[PDB]
C-alpha cells in the first residue's frame, strides 16, 4: 500500500561516483529526505546484482571486461572501444561495482513488486536505458531497466516500459524488439545528430515483436501541455491494445528546462501529469530515474514526482539541508520554462499519433 | 615567419586530464603529428604561469582557493560553490597545475608574438573563455585568453579578440567590457536556456568600453556558407573601425556537426574560411582552441585548421596513428553536415548585422 | 580485361559440404565448365582467409567458438545458440574451414580487382550476407561479402553493395549501417514472418550512415519486367547520388521460379538485365552468389549470368556433363515463370521508389 524507496547510504555513495553525474544521487535523496518524504515510504536496502543476474541480459565477454578494467580504472585497454567504453562511458575504477549496485537496485525493486510488498517501487538512481547486452552506451554500463523487466516477467505476463527520458530508450527497446510480452514506449528528441540517432516513429520492433515497440519522435522546445497531450494520447491507445499487467517507468529529467542539453522545455509538473495517468492504472509500477544534467533541477523534479506518487503537495520553499547551498539563489521547488520556441508543428504531431494508432491496431 | 606550435609531452599529458575532455589534447596533437604538420612549425615548450601572472586578472582569493582544493581534489569544500567549482567545474586534484599550465601556454604564445619570433602562435589546449576573475565557469578554471591578451598589450595598442566557439565568450568580454583598447567579437548560439545566457546583439560593453564589445546571436542549424557571410560581414566592419594591431582567435570546435551539443551544423572548412580572412590581415595572431566534445572531430577540425595556417592541403585519408580507430568507420578527415534545419531567418541575421554596423560607427 | 573466376577443385569440394546446399558448388562449376566458359576467364585459386582477416569484422569470441565446434562438429555446445548456430546454421564439422575458405575466396576476388588484374571477379560460392560480426545467421557463418568490401576499401573510396538475393542482406547492411563510404542496396521479399524480418523501405542506416542504406521491400510473384524496372530506377538514382568507385554484387538465385521457397517468379534473364546495367558502369565489380535452393536452377542461372558477363549467348541445350540427369524435364538452360499472381500493387511500388528517391537526395 505504501511505496517502496530503494535506498542505502552505501548505494547513494556509489551512485555519486558516476562520471557524468557526480553527487547527483546524494542531492536527490537529500532533497527527498529534507521534505521528509522518506518517512512516508518503506525504505528497502538494495542487493547487488550477481554475475548470474546481470548475465541474464549482458554477455559474459562484456561483463568480464567491465569487471577487469573496473579493477584500477584502466581507461587505455585496447578492447574497451569495442565494448563501448570511452568518452561517454569512461572506465572509471569501481564502475563494475556501481553498475552491479544499480542493476541490483532495480532488480530488488521488481522483486518487491512481485512479492506484493507494494504497488510502486522507486529507484531514482536507475534508468540506464542505453546499455546493450555487450556494449556500454550513453553513460550506461548496465541496463538495469532490462534486468528489472526480466525480473518482473517471472510474475507478470505483459510488461509496459515507458521511457520519458530526453533520449530514445534504445537499449531497452533493443533487448525486447523481438518480444511481444514486453512493449516499449519512448518519447524522445529525434533529430539528425542527436544521440542515439534511433527511435523514429517507423521503428516498431522486429519479427514476432513487430508493433510491440512504440516511438514518438519530438522536436526541441516542447512544453508541458503539448507533451502531456502526446503522452496521454499514446498511452491511452497502448493501454487499451496491450493491457499491461505491470509497468516500468523511466523518468529522465534531462527534458526539464534548465538542463544544459537545452532541448525540451518541460517542468516537473508536466511529467507529473504523465506519471499520474500511469498510476491511475493501479498496476505494479517500477519507477526509475535516468538523465538529468542540471543536478539541482533533477533533484527538484524527482522530489516533486515522489510527492506525486505519495499524493502530497510539497512546500514551494526549498527546506534547508546538506546541499541547501546548491539550490541558490532563489531556493524554490518550481521550475520555469525557458523563453524559446516549440519547434513541433501540430500537423506533424498529429501525423505521428495516427501512424502509431495504426500500428497499435495490430496488437491483439 | 614559420608558425609557433605550443607543445610539450608533459603539457599535453596535463591537458588530457581535464574532466570534460579526457585525452582530447593527445588526440589533437597525435593527428597533427600523424599529418607531419609539426615538422613545418616551430615547436615551443610552454612555461607554467606564475601566481603573479595569473593574478594580473584573477583575484588572490580565487587563486588561493583553486590551489587549495587542487591539492587532493577536495570537491566538498563549502566555499567552492561561490568560486564556481561544482558540476561544470569539478575540483579535480591537480587542476590548479593544469590551469596554470594552460595559462602559461597562452602567455608563452603571446610572448612569442611579441618577440617577433612569428606572426602566428598556436595553443590548441587554450581558449577557456568563460572563467571570471574570481570564479570558474563553463569548464574553465583560468582565463588563458585574457592572460594572453594582457601579455600582448605590452606591445600592441589594440587587440582584437574573436571568439568562434559555440558559446558566448563571456569571460573575455567581461574582463575588457570597460576597455576600448581590446575589442571582443563573439559569434555564438543565443537562446533562452543555453549557456551562458549572455551575449545578445544589444550587449556592447560598458563605460569607456561602450561599443567595443560585439555579439552576434545565432540560432541552431547554421551551416558553413551563411556562417561565413555573417563572420566576414562583421569582421570587415570591425577591422575597418577598430584597426587592430594584434589578434587572439578562439576556435572552439563545438560548432562542428557531430558534436554532442548538436546545435550549429558547421564543418572545419567553413571555420577555415573565417580563419583565412583573419590571417590575410597579416597581423600577429594567437590561435586558441576551446570547446569540442566530439573528440575525434575536434582533432579533425584543428588539424585541418593547422593545415590552413600552413597553407597546406591535407590528405583525405586519416593516416594511421595512436588513435586511428577513433576515426572509424569512414576514416576520413572531412566532416559532413547533419540533415537538420537552419533555424536562422535571413531577415533577423540582416537585422543583427545592421545593429552591429551601427554600433561600430561609434568606434573611432 | 578478362574476368577472373575464383575456382579450385579443393574449394568447390569444401563448398559442396555446406549443410543447406549439398553439391551445389560442383553443379554450378560443372555446368559452367560444360559450356566451356572457364576457358574464357582467368582462373584464380582462392587463398584461405587468415584469423586476422576474418577478425577485421568478426569478433574473436565468435571466431574461436566457430573453430572450436568445427573440430568434430559439436552441435550440442551450450554457447552455440548465442552465436547463432542451430537449425539454420548447424555446427557441421569442418565448417570453420569452409567459412574461412569462402571468406578467403571473396577476399582473393577483391584483391584481384585492386591489383587491376581485372574489372570483374567472380565467386559464385560466396554471398553469405546474413552473418553478423558475432553471430551466424541464415545459412551464413562468415560474411564474406563484408570481408570483400573491407578489402576493396583499401583502394576504392566508395563501394556500392547491391544485394539481389531473395532475402534482405541484413548482415552486410548491418556491418556498414554507420558508414557513408559503403552504400548498401537490397531488393528482397519483405513480409511479416519472412526471414530475416528486416529491410523495410524506412530502414536507411544510422548516424553518419543515415541514408546510405537502401531497402526495396517486394511482395511475392514479381517477374522479370517489373523487377528490372524497380532495380533500374533505384540503381540509376543511387549511381547518380553516390557515384561508386567499385561494386560488390550479390546474386542469390532463390528469386528464380522453381525455387522451393516459391516467392519471387524471376528468370535468369531478368536478373541478367540488372547485371548488364551495373556492368555498363565500367567499374571494378565483385560478383557473388548466395541463396538458391533449386540446385539445377541455381547452376542454370549463374551459368547464364557468367555468359552475360562474358558477352556470350549460350546454347539452349544443356550440354552433357556429370549432372545432366538433374536438368529434367526439358534439359534446357531457360527457366519458365510459374503461373501465379504478382502480389505487387503498382501504386505501392511507386510509393516505395519515391521514398527512396527522396532519401537519396540527402546523399552528397
Amino acid at each position: 500500500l505504501v511505496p517502496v524507496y530503494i535506498y542505502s547510504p552505501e548505494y547513494v555513495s556509489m551512485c555519486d561516483s558516476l562520471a557524468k553525474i557526480p553527487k547527483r544521487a546524494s542531492m536527490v535523496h537529500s532533497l527527498i529526505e529534507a521534505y521528509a518524504l522518506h518517512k512516508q515510504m518503506r525504505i528497502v536496502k538494495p542487493k547487488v546484482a550477481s554475475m548470474e543476474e546481470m548475465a541474464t541480459f549482458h554477455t559474459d565477454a562484456y561483463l568480464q571486461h567491465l569487471q577487469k578494467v573496473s579493477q584500477e580504472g584502466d581507461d587505455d585497454h585496447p578492447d574497451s572501444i569495442e565494448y563501448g567504453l570511452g568518452y561517454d562511458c569512461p572506465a572509471t575504477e569501481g564502475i563494475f561495482d556501481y553498475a552491479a549496485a544499480i542493476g541490483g537496485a532495480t532488480i530488488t525493486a521488481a522483486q518487491c513488486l512481485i512479492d506484493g510488498m507494494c504497488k510502486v517501487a522507486i529507484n531514482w538512481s536507475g534508468g540506464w536505458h542505453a546499455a546493450k547486452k555487450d556494449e556500454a552506451s550513453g553513460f550506461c554500463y548496465l541496463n538495469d531497466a532490462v534486468l528489472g523487466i526480466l525480473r518482473l516477467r517471472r510474475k507478470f505476463e505483459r510488461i509496459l516500459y515507458v521511457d520519458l527520458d530526453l533520449h530514445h530508450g534504445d537499449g531497452v527497446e533493443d533487448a525486447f524488439s523481438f518480444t511481444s510480452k514486453v512493449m516499449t514506449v519512448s518519447l524522445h528528441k529525434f533529430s539528425p545528430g542527436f544521440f542515439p540517432g534511433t527511435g523514429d516513429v517507423s521503428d516498431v520492433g522486429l519479427g514476432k515483436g513487430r508493433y510491440y515497440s512504440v516511438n514518438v519522435p519530438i522536436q526541441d522546445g516542447i512544453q508541458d501541455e503539448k507533451y502531456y497531450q502526446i503522452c496521454e494520447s499514446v498511452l491511452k491507445e497502448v493501454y487499451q491494445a496491450f493491457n499491461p499487467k505491470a509497468v516500468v517507468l523511466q523518468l529522465g529529467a534531462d527534458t526539464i528546462a534548465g538542463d544544459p542539453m537545452c532541448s525540451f522545455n518541460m517542468t516537473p509538473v508536466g511529467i507529473g501529469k504523465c506519471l499520474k495517468y500511469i498510476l491511475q492504472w493501479q498496476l505494479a509500477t517500477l519507477i526509475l530515474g535516468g538523465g538529468g544534467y542540471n543536478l539541482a533541477n533533477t533533484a527538484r523534479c524527482w522530489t516533486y514526482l515522489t510527492g506525486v506518487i505519495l499524493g502530497k503537495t510539497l512546500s514551494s520553499e526549498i527546506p534547508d539541508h546538506e546541499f541547501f547551498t546548491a539550490y541558490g539563489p532563489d531556493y524554490v521547488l518550481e521550475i520555469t520554462p525557458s523563453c524559446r520556441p516549440d519547434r513541433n508543428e501540430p500537423h506533424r504531431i498529429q501525423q505521428i499519433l495516427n501512424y502509431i494508432k495504426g500500428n497499435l491496431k495490430h496488437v491483439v | 615567419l614559420v608558425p609557433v606550435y605550443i607543445y610539450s609531452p608533459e603539457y599535453v599529458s596535463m591537458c588530457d586530464s581535464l574532466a570534460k575532455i579526457p585525452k582530447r589534447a593527445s588526440m589533437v596533437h597525435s593527428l597533427i603529428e600523424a599529418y607531419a604538420l609539426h615538422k613545418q612549425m616551430r615547436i615551443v615548450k610552454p612555461k607554467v604561469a606564475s601566481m603573479e601572472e595569473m593574478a594580473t586578472f584573477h583575484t588572490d582569493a580565487y587563486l588561493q582557493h583553486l590551489q587549495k582544493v587542487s591539492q587532493e581534489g577536495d570537491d566538498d569544500h563549502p566555499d567552492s560553490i561561490e568560486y564556481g567549482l561544482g558540476y561544470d567545474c569539478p575540483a579535480t586534484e591537480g587542476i590548479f597545475d593544469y590551469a596554470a599550465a594552460i595559462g602559461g601556454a597562452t602567455i608563452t604564445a603571446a610572448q612569442c608574438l611579441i618577440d617577433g619570433m612569428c606572426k602566428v602562435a598556436i595553443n590548441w589546449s587554450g581558449g577557456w573563455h568563460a572563467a571570471k576573475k574570481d570564479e570558474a565557469s563553463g569548464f574553465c578554471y583560468l582565463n588563458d585568453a585574457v592572460l594572453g591578451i594582457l601579455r600582448l598589450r605590452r606591445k600592441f595598442e589594440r587587440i582584437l579578440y574573436v571568439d568562434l566557439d559555440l558559446h558566448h565568450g563571456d569571460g573575455v568580454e567581461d574582463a575588457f567590457s570597460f576597455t576600448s583598447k581590446v575589442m571582443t567579437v563573439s559569434l555564438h548560439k543565443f537562446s533562452p536556456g543555453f549557456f551562458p545566457g549572455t551575449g545578445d546583439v544589444s550587449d556592447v560593453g560598458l563605460g569607456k568600453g561602450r561599443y567595443y564589445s560585439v555579439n552576434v546571436p545565432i540560432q541552431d542549424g547554421i551551416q558553413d556558407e551563411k556562417y561565413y557571410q555573417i563572420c566576414e560581414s562583421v569582421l570587415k566592419e570591425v577591422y575597418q573601425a577598430f584597426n587592430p594591431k594584434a589578434v587572439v582567435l578562439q576556435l572552439g570546435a563545438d560548432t562542428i556537426a557531430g558534436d554532442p551539443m548538436c546545435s550549429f551544423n558547421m564543418t572545419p572548412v567553413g571555420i577555415g574560411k573565417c580563419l583565412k580572412y583573419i590571417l590575410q590581415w597579416q597581423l600577429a595572431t594567437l590561435i586558441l582552441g576551446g570547446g569540442g566534445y566530439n573528440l575525434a572531430n575536434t582533432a579533425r577540425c584543428w588539424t585541418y585548421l593547422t593545415g590552413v595556417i600552413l597553407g597546406k592541403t591535407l590528405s583525405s585519408e586519416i593516416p594511421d596513428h595512436e588513435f586511428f580507430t577513433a576515426y572509424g568507420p569512414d576514416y576520413v578527415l572531412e566532416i559532413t553536415p547533419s540533415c537538420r534545419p537552419d533555424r536562422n531567418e535571413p531577415h533577423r541575421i540582416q537585422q543583427i548585422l545592421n545593429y552591429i554596423k551601427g554600433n561600430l560607427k561609434h568606434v573611432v | 580485361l578478362v574476368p577472373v573466376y575464383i575456382y579450385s577443385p579443393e574449394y568447390v569440394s569444401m563448398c559442396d559440404s555446406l549443410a543447406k546446399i549439398p553439391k551445389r558448388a560442383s553443379m554450378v562449376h560443372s555446368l559452367i565448365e560444360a559450356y566451356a566458359l572457364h576457358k574464357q576467364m582467368r582462373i584464380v585459386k582462392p587463398k584461405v582467409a587468415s584469423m586476422e582477416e576474418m577478425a577485421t569484422f568478426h569478433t574473436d569470441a565468435y571466431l574461436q567458438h566457430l573453430q572450436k565446434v568445427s573440430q568434430e562438429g559439436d552441435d550440442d555446445h551450450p554457447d552455440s545458440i548465442e552465436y547463432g548456430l542451430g537449425y539454420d546454421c548447424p555446427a557441421t564439422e569442418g565448417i570453420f574451414d569452409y567459412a574461412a575458405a569462402i571468406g578467403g575466396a571473396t577476399i582473393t576476388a577483391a584483391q584481384c580487382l585492386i591489383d587491376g588484374m581485372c574489372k570483374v571477379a567472380i565467386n559464385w560460392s560466396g554471398g553469405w550476407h546474413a552473418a553478423k560480426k558475432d553471430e551466424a545467421s541464415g545459412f551464413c557463418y562468415l560474411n564474406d561479402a563484408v570481408l570483400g568490401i573491407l578489402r576493396l576499401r583499401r583502394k576504392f573510396e566508395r563501394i556500392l553493395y547491391v544485394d539481389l538475393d531473395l532475402h534482405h542482406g541484413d548482415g552486410v547492411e548491418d556491418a556498414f549501417s554507420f558508414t557513408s563510404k559503403v552504400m548498401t542496396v537490397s531488393l528482397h521479399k519483405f513480409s511479416p514472418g519472412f526471414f530475416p524480418g528486416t529491410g523495410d523501405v524506412s530502414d536507411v542506416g544510422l548516424g553518419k550512415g543515415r541514408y546510405y542504406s537502401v531497402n526495396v521491400p517486394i511482395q511475392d510473384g514479381i517477374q522479370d519486367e517489373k523487377y528490372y524496372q524497380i532495380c533500374e530506377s533505384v540503381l540509376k538514382e543511387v549511381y547518380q547520388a553516390f557515384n561508386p568507385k567499385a561494386v560488390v554484387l550479390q546474386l542469390g538465385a532463390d528469386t528464380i521460379a522453381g525455387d522451393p521457397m516459391c516467392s519471387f517468379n524471376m528468370t535468369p534473364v531478368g536478373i541478367g538485365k540488372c547485371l548488364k546495367y551495373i556492368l555498363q558502369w565500367q567499374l571494378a565489380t565483385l560478383i557473388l552468389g548466395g541463396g538458391g535452393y533449386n540446385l539445377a536452377n541455381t547452376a542454370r542461372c549463374w551459368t547464364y549470368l557468367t555468359g552475360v558477363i562474358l558477352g556470350k549467348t549460350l546454347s539452349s541445350e544443356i550440354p552433357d556433363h556429370e549432372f545432366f540427369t538433374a536438368y529434367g524435364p526439358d534439359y534446357v538452360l531457360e527457366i519458365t515463370p510459374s503461373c501465379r499472381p504478382d502480389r505487387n500493387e503498382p501504386h505501392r511500388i511507386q510509393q516505395i521508389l519515391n521514398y527512396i528517391k527522396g532519401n537519396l537526395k540527402h546523399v552528397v
Partner: peptide, 4 residues
C-alpha cells in the same frame, strides 16, 4: 556513431 553519435556521442551523447
Amino acid at each position: 556513431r553519435h556521442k551523447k
